[PDB]
Write a protein that holds these residues in place. Sequence first.
Motif, PDB file in Angstrom:
ATOM      1  N   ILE A  28       0.699  -1.336  -0.072  1.00 29.34           N
ATOM      2  CA  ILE A  28      -0.308   0.399  -0.340  1.00 29.34           C
ATOM      3  C   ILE A  28       0.920   1.528   0.031  1.00 29.34           C
ATOM      4  N   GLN A  29       1.849   1.219   0.545  1.00 30.17           N
ATOM      5  CA  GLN A  29       2.778   2.456   0.240  1.00 30.17           C
ATOM      6  C   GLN A  29       3.973   2.497  -0.007  1.00 30.17           C
ATOM      7  N   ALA A  30       4.573   1.692  -0.401  1.00 32.89           N
ATOM      8  CA  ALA A  30       5.671   1.382  -2.062  1.00 32.89           C
ATOM      9  C   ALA A  30       5.611   1.948  -2.953  1.00 32.89           C
ATOM     10  N   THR A  31       6.205   3.016  -3.471  1.00 35.59           N
ATOM     11  CA  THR A  31       6.717   3.322  -4.404  1.00 35.59           C
ATOM     12  C   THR A  31       7.696   3.822  -4.978  1.00 35.59           C
ATOM     13  N   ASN A  32       8.048   3.481  -6.362  1.00 37.29           N
ATOM     14  CA  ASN A  32       9.448   3.462  -7.369  1.00 37.29           C
ATOM     15  C   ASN A  32       9.966   4.481  -7.527  1.00 37.29           C
ATOM     16  N   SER A  33      11.153   4.707  -8.157  1.00 38.57           N
ATOM     17  CA  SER A  33      11.181   6.636  -8.682  1.00 38.57           C
ATOM     18  C   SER A  33      10.272   6.706 -10.282  1.00 38.57           C
ATOM     19  N   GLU A  34       9.650   5.610 -10.671  1.00 43.48           N
ATOM     20  CA  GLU A  34       8.637   6.754 -11.253  1.00 43.48           C
ATOM     21  C   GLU A  34       7.639   7.000 -11.196  1.00 43.48           C
ATOM     22  N   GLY A  35       7.445   6.727  -9.181  1.00 42.31           N
ATOM     23  CA  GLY A  35       5.634   6.440  -9.082  1.00 42.31           C
ATOM     24  C   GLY A  35       5.179   5.305  -8.880  1.00 42.31           C
ATOM     25  N   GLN A  36       5.684   4.491  -9.276  1.00 38.74           N
ATOM     26  CA  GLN A  36       4.184   3.466  -9.487  1.00 38.74           C
ATOM     27  C   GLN A  36       4.348   2.210  -8.363  1.00 38.74           C
ATOM     28  N   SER A  37       2.806   2.543  -7.495  1.00 40.50           N
ATOM     29  CA  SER A  37       2.724   1.052  -6.626  1.00 40.50           C
ATOM     30  C   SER A  37       3.322  -0.414  -7.245  1.00 40.50           C
ATOM     31  N   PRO A  38       3.399  -1.041  -6.679  1.00 37.64           N
ATOM     32  CA  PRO A  38       4.304  -2.344  -7.127  1.00 37.64           C
ATOM     33  C   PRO A  38       2.797  -3.401  -7.599  1.00 37.64           C
ATOM     34  N   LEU A  39       1.245  -2.992  -7.732  1.00 33.17           N
ATOM     35  CA  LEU A  39       0.688  -3.594  -8.593  1.00 33.17           C
ATOM     36  C   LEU A  39       0.574  -2.797  -9.732  1.00 33.17           C
ATOM     37  N   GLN A  40       0.855  -1.511  -9.665  1.00 31.13           N
ATOM     38  CA  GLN A  40       1.108  -0.705 -10.651  1.00 31.13           C
ATOM     39  C   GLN A  40       2.034  -1.465 -11.720  1.00 31.13           C
ATOM     40  N   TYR A  41       2.918  -1.710 -11.372  1.00 34.24           N
ATOM     41  CA  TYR A  41       4.014  -1.693 -11.798  1.00 34.24           C
ATOM     42  C   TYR A  41       4.287  -3.554 -12.026  1.00 34.24           C
ATOM     43  N   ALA A  42       3.136  -4.520 -11.916  1.00 31.18           N
ATOM     44  CA  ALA A  42       2.855  -5.303 -12.352  1.00 31.18           C
ATOM     45  C   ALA A  42       2.055  -5.592 -13.539  1.00 31.18           C
ATOM     46  N   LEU A  43       0.984  -4.283 -13.223  1.00 24.83           N
ATOM     47  CA  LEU A  43       0.045  -4.287 -14.515  1.00 24.83           C
ATOM     48  C   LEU A  43       0.987  -3.707 -15.750  1.00 24.83           C
ATOM     49  N   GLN A  44       1.531  -2.789 -15.640  1.00 21.32           N
ATOM     50  CA  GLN A  44       2.002  -2.365 -16.580  1.00 21.32           C
ATOM     51  C   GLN A  44       3.360  -3.416 -17.154  1.00 21.32           C
TER      52      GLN A  44
END
Length: 443
Positions: free
Chosen positions: A84-100
């Motif tokens: 719920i809290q993590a965010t990479n340098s691009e601003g993606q959540s883990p779920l967003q990163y996995a979906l993209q």
Amino acid sequence: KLSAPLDMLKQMNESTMEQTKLDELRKKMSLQAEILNKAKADNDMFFRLLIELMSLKLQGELFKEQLSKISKESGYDSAQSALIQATNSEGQSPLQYALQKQDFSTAKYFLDNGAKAGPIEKAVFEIALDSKAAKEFGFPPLPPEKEKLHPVKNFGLVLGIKTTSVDGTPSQFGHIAPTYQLMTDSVSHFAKSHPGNKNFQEIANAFQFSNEASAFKFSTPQRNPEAGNDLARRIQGGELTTIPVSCKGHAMGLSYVPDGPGSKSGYLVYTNRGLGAKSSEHGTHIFRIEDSSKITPEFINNMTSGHSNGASHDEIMSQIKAAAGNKEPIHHIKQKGQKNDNCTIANSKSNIEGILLCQKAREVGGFDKLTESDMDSVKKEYKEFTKHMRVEKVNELAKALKENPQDPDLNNLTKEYLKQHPNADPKLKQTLETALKQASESS
Ligand SMILES: [Cl-]
């Protein structure tokens, strides 16, 4: 079977929240982490071990145990707080990163461990569900009702308005078909308004040609590999040719500027201001193409189908470099960075600046003969075009607001444009302020 996609869709619908509810939940978990007074969370580290874990391709129980292990390793209470809290340098959540990444199994596991679906995650999911990977997973095609450009997207992608619709649709992220249609329309409108500008006659013709040839539905071209052959034949005929280019969940800019009609030499202009590019390379790079024949129909078809074929940023960029003979760019136009958006407008628009620079270089007889006055005139011509786009969109927004004064999305779009662009040209500020006050006087 049929269970995995249906369960995935149900879970993503059940996990859907408004942006403020997800922000409030993140603040709550931040409060709990601060009360515990333990080690501070490391997001970059957590994402490193997340990518390392996803590469292992582990099953449910193993994945869940290692997910919680790596979340504790990076200073998070649990896997849920990390997701719920993590965010990479691009601003993606883990779920967003996995979906993209079109990693639907990993995204499902993330929802199993308490990852939530904000408007950004939903938008990225909608973009990812128009892909070969989404079809092999068992998803149905996107409903045709979703092909039309949402008004918040139509105005925010062009005017740079960050907001979310009342139905939950964010201004960011969009499919290639309607946004590229918008770009073609905008370049042709600028061309018709300045019919004496030869550069933009050429640019509008190239945009129309590739918009008609690529035949995008959502984010998938519907004429492969014929569109690749058409674009390659136009390039070897010596005509300006834009190339719609994408990778998984990201759109860039690509075009070819010939030295002249029937020439074999020219320029390959590539543009990326967002995901995949380093902060120093953000913008447009010009490669010298002394033989356009390595720009093959297969290369063009791969570029147009990058997102839908599941191609990664590096595969696409490798193909572009190989098409340019693996030589370094001769010129770099720095353009401001964009994050948390697939840049369907930003990259293709900023590519036009490189197109104009190459047209001027052809005008003066080569890149080595470009003077300072030449390049400054190039940049003011590009800024004239962008100002034309911006004024047209501001007038369109004002007109639509008056012709629908009670619409929440239009009113919020106008307020948010005024509020996030205070240093805009004062006549557009006035236009939209008068639009706003006329919209309330329908009390
Ligand atoms: Cl990549």
